[PDB]
Amino acid sequence: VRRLLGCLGSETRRLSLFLVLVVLSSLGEMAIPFFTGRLTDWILQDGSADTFTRNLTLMSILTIASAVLEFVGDGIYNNTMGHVHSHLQGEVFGAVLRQETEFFQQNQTGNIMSRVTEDTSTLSDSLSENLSLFLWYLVRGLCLLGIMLWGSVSLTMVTLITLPLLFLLPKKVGKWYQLLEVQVRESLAKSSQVAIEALSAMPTVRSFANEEGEAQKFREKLQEIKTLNQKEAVAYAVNSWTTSISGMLLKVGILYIGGQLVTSGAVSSGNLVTFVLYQMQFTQAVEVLLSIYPRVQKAVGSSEKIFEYLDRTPRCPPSGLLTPLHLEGLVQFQDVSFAYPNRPDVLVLQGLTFTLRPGEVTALVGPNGSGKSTVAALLQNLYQPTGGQLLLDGKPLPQYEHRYLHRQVAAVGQEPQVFGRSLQENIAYGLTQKPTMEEITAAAVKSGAHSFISGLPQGYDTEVDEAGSQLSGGQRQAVALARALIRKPCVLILDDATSALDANSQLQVEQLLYESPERYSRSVLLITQHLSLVEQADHILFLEGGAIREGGTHQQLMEKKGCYWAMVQA
Amino acid sequence: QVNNKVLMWRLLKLSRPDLPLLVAAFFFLVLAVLGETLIPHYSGRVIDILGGDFDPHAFASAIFFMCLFSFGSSLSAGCRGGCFTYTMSRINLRIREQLFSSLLRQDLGFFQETKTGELNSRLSSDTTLMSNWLPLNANVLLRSLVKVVGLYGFMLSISPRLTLLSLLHMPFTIAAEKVYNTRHQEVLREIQDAVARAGQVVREAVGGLQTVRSFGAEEHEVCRYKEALEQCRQLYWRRDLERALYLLVRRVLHLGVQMLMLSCGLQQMQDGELTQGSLLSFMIYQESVGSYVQTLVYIYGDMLSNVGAAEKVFSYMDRQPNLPSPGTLAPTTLQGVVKFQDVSFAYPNRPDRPVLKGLTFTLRPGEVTALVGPNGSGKSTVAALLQNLYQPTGGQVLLDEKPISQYEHCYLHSQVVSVGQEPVLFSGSVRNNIAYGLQSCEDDKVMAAAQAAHADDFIQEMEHGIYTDVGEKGSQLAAGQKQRLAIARALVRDPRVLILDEATSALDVQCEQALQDWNSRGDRTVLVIAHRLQTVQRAHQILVLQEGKLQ
Ligand SMILES: Nc1ncnc2c1ncn2[C@@H]1O[C@H](COP(=O)(O)OP(=O)(O)OP(=O)(O)O)[C@@H](O)[C@H]1O
């Protein structure tokens, strides 16, 4: 694969050094059969003894140097593949989070994680082991064939001619083996389906008392299977015979041709000893190489499936480019109609018209199922309006930078979530830098977490689990309000903030919203069903469904005699 | 461990009739091994001849002995592999038949508490992976036992002095493996923890990305994932470093013996106690023993690890049934009376919640009764007690001054059959499903009993015979939605007592089975159950059921 090879491009210097060290180790490893032949011939020739003290020393130095260079080469290759695996897992993770929120839909939680965590590690482990073994044995197979041409020119032609005879016939008869084993496995599944069907209706079987009929029906399929596997045992007997006669008759032909060649005066008897010891090493080198090849062939196709997933393109705009100072904070909604990208054929929102002026309160109340939480998600950059204009200081949301905008607009969800970290880190989550210890306490006092977490023995450094076992419902909403308040945002959105939150915290959130001087620099939007909170709201909107039915202040809506009074008295 | 000993002894006793196949396989394995370790000895004989005065008589005789041992060893190895895979299939067919025959005599509490998918996996797939435990392990074990003895026997014949040099370094290989496997198991625990911490970040970020995207902290999850990847990387490098160091030590220790073996080989063969071909025979022999002794020392651990899959199959076969003790009856003449008193039956699956309370009623040979109940009051529950399908936990059912548990398995159910709201149609033909439960003598009774409901128009219109195939459930049945076929099945066996759970209904126009139309000829009792209170034509007894109570 071109792009997989192009991924491993910066490690060309280390890959070149690894190939050299493998060649130097493979050359030095083939020393013991190559030195057995001369020393045995030297005694039979009645030679001098001034070489035996040196030839054994030289042959031991070579394979010792081959052992170390194998260890150094295996050390480098294991180090470089580790950095590649760590780099590939990081980049496939960052490509996942860059897609739009439509792709997730709270249902791909299992398939995405199997594609990021499970497959990537198993693919790189298969690549790092099979390519290492394929490269090690290919060099050993090539080096042995290089020196077998040197020792003889006739016997090395014989073993190359009969090598396809060794490794093509067992494959062909092997194809006959599971061709008949397919029918045995198929008949085994068919017999089990009959027995299961006769067992699931057991009250019908027990009422008629026909267990002997089911025993005979099960036995008929077993006798047909017993006929079929008798041919299976014959097929393996032929298959196991022909993989063992070709291997051992090859050694006879090598020795007999060598027996004819030695007696002609071409090579000595000791040169045949080296060639005999090279046959068994070359045969296993070929056999290991052929078994490796199905593993790499399948794994390359799996890597092409991950690589096509890597270049998935999103549908949302990437980010913005403008960072201003002295933000106004007013956000204008003008003819905004939104449809869910899951089901674009049905419209779920249309005809919104309001303005969140700075320093005032605009709270919208609607019945159950009216679809108000999708409006608050539309306020930030979670989704996009299909046919409307969303204006924030004269500019749309994608025109602003992703990191700056969400630091300026903070919101809590209908169901707040708690990450498994320290509560000091979870309060200041998402911030560019960690603030001082006093600013966290100032944000926690305003939210009300300091009135409860002071009693905990762990202080502000308590460790919490993955999802809400240590913190209660009141505590989860208490740490959620502190999280959206530490950054001091310009637009604050609360969704069911006081649904389960305690009465003392519903108290001091009211002078914060209505009496505190900090409301002058923010524009707030509330979606709450509590009638004891929207009395001092400057703008009140009614969302019965789809679009706004009516809107106004507190006194105007009561004097109008609309649906707002009817919902209040209920 | 004593838990795996009882399962191994039962599994060994499961292969009792396959002893002649195991003996022949062991005999063919010994001959195949003996042929394999004899060719390298003859290989040293040819090199011995080639280095001296050449004579073609012994050289051709040596080659002819290579061919005779080559055909002999290949035929012995070929017949061994075929015989082993025939035993594997014959063992598999025996355990599968024994399991289903034992499972057919189990109570209905087992078939409703346990899913049918679980029984399918323990019958179709688990017994295939369980049957091949013995032929795979016996082939591996008996190969390494003979070959190690065979090769070391060939060691001592060549050179007793040079054998002991390679016999006194095997503890070095064993000590190297023992110290390496302990360190490798400790590192693997750390890798599993670090890969669990890496997955912890992905549980946090992917599942709650709505909170992450709404605060602009997607780069924080990317940065936090790099720390988890670096810790997994460092542990991966330590695992690869300790593995590569172990291979270097083992290869060096193996080399030092080979250098020492050859150095004593050249010195001994110089003086005249060895030949050139003897050294070649010793070198080829010595490389074979190194791998096979390592398989032999670690076969018991692999065998016990793979044997831990027969617990579920052996528990299903040997579990105790809940059926009561059967007995004999009087099948000479039957008076056709059923008596009932003080039922307090509850399901064994749910003994806490009862279904039927104390009620009594009787069935008469010349009378027909009716049972009416709105819903969930024991409509077909009473019908399950009469046919000995379920046994009461309170009170009993009588049949002419004797209970139902002492009746035999065959004659009681042949005289009492019933039809329900869901008539299950089994695989096969129409004739096989009309006369299900009958051993024989159906070839002269199907044509007179299938025309009970509305003669024959559904079957007579096509194929002009009863041999029309049906298939599985959900098939081409259109005779009143496979209801006409079920009632005609009931009247084949001419039972004395018939229970109709959800008969008549919209097919009450076909009323040839309720009154004298079926019963009242001689003595015959019919029990009728209806959902809505329809007026019982020619009624004799009216019973209305409400929460296990009747008026
Ligand atoms: N991802 C989604 N894609 C498509 N439709 C969705 C999706 N999530 C929710 N919905 C549906 O669209 C509706 C839009 O309503 P929305 O979620 O805005 O209401 P809500 O304010 O959360 O509800 P409530 O009345 O309980 O306060 C939901 O009630 C639900 O039926």
Ligand SMILES: Nc1ncnc2c1ncn2[C@@H]1O[C@H](COP(=O)(O)OP(=O)(O)O)[C@@H](O)[C@H]1O
């Ligand atoms: N197979 C079963 N296993 C356990 N309880 C059952 C079973 N079938 C029915 N019951 C219980 O027995 C009560 C009576 O059911 P019943 O009226 O006999 O059903 P039907 O009307 O189908 O004959 C029901 O309330 C039900 O909860």
Ligand SMILES: [Mg+2]
């Ligand atoms: Mg909502």
Ligand SMILES: [Mg+2]
């Ligand atoms: Mg019923």
